[PDB]
Copies of this chain bind each other. A is one copy, B any other.
Amino acid sequence: NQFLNFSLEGKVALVTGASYGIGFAIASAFAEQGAKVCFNDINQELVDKGMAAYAAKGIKAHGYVCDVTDEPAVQAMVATIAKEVGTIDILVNNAGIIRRVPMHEMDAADFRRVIDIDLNAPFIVAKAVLPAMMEKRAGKIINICSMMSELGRETVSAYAAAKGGLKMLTRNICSEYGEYNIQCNGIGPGYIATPQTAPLREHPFDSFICAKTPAGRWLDPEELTGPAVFLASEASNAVNGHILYVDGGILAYIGKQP
């Protein structure tokens, strides 16, 4: 029953920037579902750290040093993967940065670097994997979007612009490459409880998040892996050009009032 197939068995998956964090969680989940998982990071130490962490979880991953804004390096990475592992079946554009600076104070170079990593690079990696997917008439591209794909906030103009950009990039890849049985979709994460934010739950910030979220809690990073597996599997083949928000209800809710 292809329609209820949530297995990724035998599929080759590349998740960018997945030496740790949400990418690592999504890639580990793909491995658990039978996928052959690949990732990149920016230096050998991070990739080494990534590889060992995967290996400690019983996952033989394939790790590459690669800057996702450098198209020659990206193409060579995809070329290798295709030869050593298999042509990429599943791409997750996960690698990303954030800056927090008032827009009117932000250096032009810094705004452009946010756009370059968070919007231009997803296009580059997508472009690199699409020939082989078109050829096989099968492929999944998942763009890690954001609540900032929909809503703005002070200090994050460049990130919001990038993420709003990525959303339309998802819809365009759907429109342009859908006819090849390629599905390009988005995940928009809510507020994820990462180790770094632990002191914000030790709390006024915690109260604000909990009040804002119908579910009344932060999300565990692993709560994104179910959505990620779904979009990467045959079960979601008719889902295309869609941003799947995983936010515990935030974007649906006007908020808890006093």
A contact residues, range: 35 or more
Q: Among B103, B119, B124, B169, which residue has its beta carbon within 8 angstroms of that of A172?
A: B103
**In the complex, what's the smallest C-beta–C-beta distance from A10 to chain B, in angstroms?**
24
A108 interfacial by beta-carbon distance below 8 Å: yes
Tally of this chain's copies: 2
Residues of B within 8 A of A161 (CB): 119, 123, 165-166, 168-169, 172
Q: Given A172-B103, A173-B103, answer yes or no on A123-B157 (Cβ-Cβ < 8 Å).
A: yes
Give complex CA distance A114, B168 in Å: 14
Closest residue on chain B to residue A109 by CB atoms: B71
A91 interfacial by beta-carbon distance below 8 Å: no
Residues of B within 8 A of A167 (CB): 164
Pick 12 A–B contacts, CB within 8 A, sort by A: A103-B127, A104-B134, A115-B115, A150-B168, A152-B168, A152-B171, A152-B172, A155-B176, A157-B172, A161-B168, A162-B165, A164-B164
Interface residues of A (CB under 8 A from B): 71, 102-104, 106, 108, 111-112, 115-116, 119-120, 123-124, 126-127, 130-131, 134, 148-158, 160-169, 171-177, 241
